[PDB]
Amino acid sequence: AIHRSDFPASFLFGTATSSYQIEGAYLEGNKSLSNWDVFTHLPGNIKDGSNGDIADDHYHRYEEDVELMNSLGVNAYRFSISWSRILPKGRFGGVNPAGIDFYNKLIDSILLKGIQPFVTLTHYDIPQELEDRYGAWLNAEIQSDFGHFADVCFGAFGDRVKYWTTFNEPNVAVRHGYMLGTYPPSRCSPPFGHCARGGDSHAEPYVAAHNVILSHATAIEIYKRKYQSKQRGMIGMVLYSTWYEPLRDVPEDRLATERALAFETPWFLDPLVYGDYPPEMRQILGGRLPSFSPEDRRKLRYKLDFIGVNHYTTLYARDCMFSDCPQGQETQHALAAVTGESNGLPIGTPTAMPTFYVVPDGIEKMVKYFMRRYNNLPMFITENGYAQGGDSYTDAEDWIDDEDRIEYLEGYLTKLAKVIRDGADVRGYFAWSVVDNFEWLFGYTLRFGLYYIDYRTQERSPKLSALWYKEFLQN
């Protein structure tokens, strides 16, 4: 139904991964332990008790994986840099040459094939030492550690990297880390949970996000002052971007939907474009959102060059400001509750990933929301994809037969082409993911790959969706 010629000639088409999810070699090349290395070696977090010690062994097998994505006909590859490989002990501990060498080799390998790097600096990971030393995102010192990490990466790689992302889904990582306590550093308080480390779910998430925002600001100021004129790249941020519809078409749910939306991506994007937190959030949270100092505001004037849209799903939102709702969900402070069901029944076909429903027009509506709120600031679809999982899959052939993924990709790409025809400045699309990999708390139980991975042998095998994406990119 949809074809490559339905998109602009200069459009990026790629796949996306992250370092912890694919690399393995978790203690090789003088790399230090990350937050996720430490976390996954504790019990009671990952669904299948797995970890990323080995993952897809991409640290050793990257050349094969580059060859595979090249065989699909991609012109870009979205990946992240392991902080713990570059600055194992943070900014006073010296740059790790083996880490620099690994990413130089990866970058050179993709560019040899005409595949453009689209690089995420941080994608949930930090060296554990930064948590241990000063509590990572709860201390403003992280801004300097992140700034230094950015500076090193720009200097080492930026002659060949023209697209950078500071952070991947900090809206997810912050709320899971400090509100629900289900991600490291596993901090929370009632009514969200009882976290043995302590926490404050009504304060700490907002401090953490504040420091993420200002870490971005620190990094992009460095980029614009030191590197932009020579390197001519763009610096963005990637946000988890769910579309929301009112459960009932009445003002209270419409307003709740607008709150649900404003509490997600604008939490980060309003500061980076307008210099203040969303007024929807400020009205409710007041002083729980920290202020931006004059020094902060100087850095915020560098803004961001693009919005990285990680869009997978669409949900209904309903009001909790004037109705009593269950407490302790991540949407609590927004005074909305979200659900995939209306009168018991799904918004679109359910999938193996909780909250992920097949709702293609969500990508159009999400893009239009950014267009209206941010005056059509450039966007890239930095992740979109479909997970397989569960008892229907006993062997490779079952995973390979992924017509369900094809239908998803086809539908969402159809709607993306439409929103671009309608004026949206979307400049690329990245399928999550080229390979099955470690899906955070779900471990290996969810498989998002265009390629199937046998974790016993590390064999890569193309699923039907790999063949489909190749056909699509051939036009």
Residue numbers in the entry: 26 to 500
Lines from the paper:
Rice Os4BGlu18 is a monolignol β-glucosidase which exhibited high substrate specificity for the monolignol glucosides, coniferin (kcat/Km, 31.9 mM-1s-1), syringin (kcat/Km, 24.0 mM-1s-1), and p-coumaryl alcohol glucoside (kcat/Km, 1.4 mM-1s-1). The Os4BGlu18 structures exhibited the typical (β/α)8 TIM barrel found in other known structures of GH1 β-glucosidases. The general acid/base for catalysis is Glu194, which is located in the conserved TFNEP motif found in strand β4 of the barrel. The nucleophile residue, Glu408, is present in the ITENG motif at the C-terminal end of strand β7, consistent with Os4BGlu18 following the double displacement mechanism described for GH1.
Single crystals of Os4BGlu18 and its complex with DG yielded X-ray diffraction datasets with 1.7 and 2.1 Å resolution, respectively. The two protein molecules are linked by a single metal ion, which was best modeled by zinc, as seen in rice Os3BGlu7 (BGlu1) and Os4BGlu12 GH1 structures. This Zn2+ ion was evidentally a minor contaminant in the sodium chloride used in the protein solution, as was also likely in the Os3BGlu7 and Os4BGlu12 structures. A glycerol molecule from the cryoprotectant formed hydrogen bonds to the catalytic residues E194 (acid/base) and E408 (nucleophile), and other residues around the active site cleft, including Q46, N193, E464, and W465. The distance between the delta carbon atoms of the E194 and E408 was measured at 5.3 Å, similar to the distance between acid/base and nucleophile in other GH1 structures. In addition, a MES molecule from the crystallization buffer was observed at the entrance of the active site pocket of the native Os4BGlu18 structure, although it had no direct polar interactions with the surrounding amino acid residues. One disulfide bond in loop B is conserved for plant GH1 enzymes, which was found between C213 and C220 in Os4BGlu18, and another disulfide bond was found in loop C (C345 to C350). Therefore, the natural substrates were docked into the Os4BGlu18 structure, in order to check the interactions of Os4BGlu18 with coniferin, p-coumaryl alcohol glucoside, and syringin ligands. Strong binding energies were displayed against these ligands with the ΔG of -8.80, -8.33, and -7.63 kcal/mol, respectively. At the entrance of the catalytic cleft of Os4BGlu18 are found several amino acid residues with hydrophobic side chains, including Y149, V197, Y208, Y265, M378, F381, W465, L466 and F473, which further maintain the ligand in the aglycone binding site through pi-pi and hydrophobic interactions.
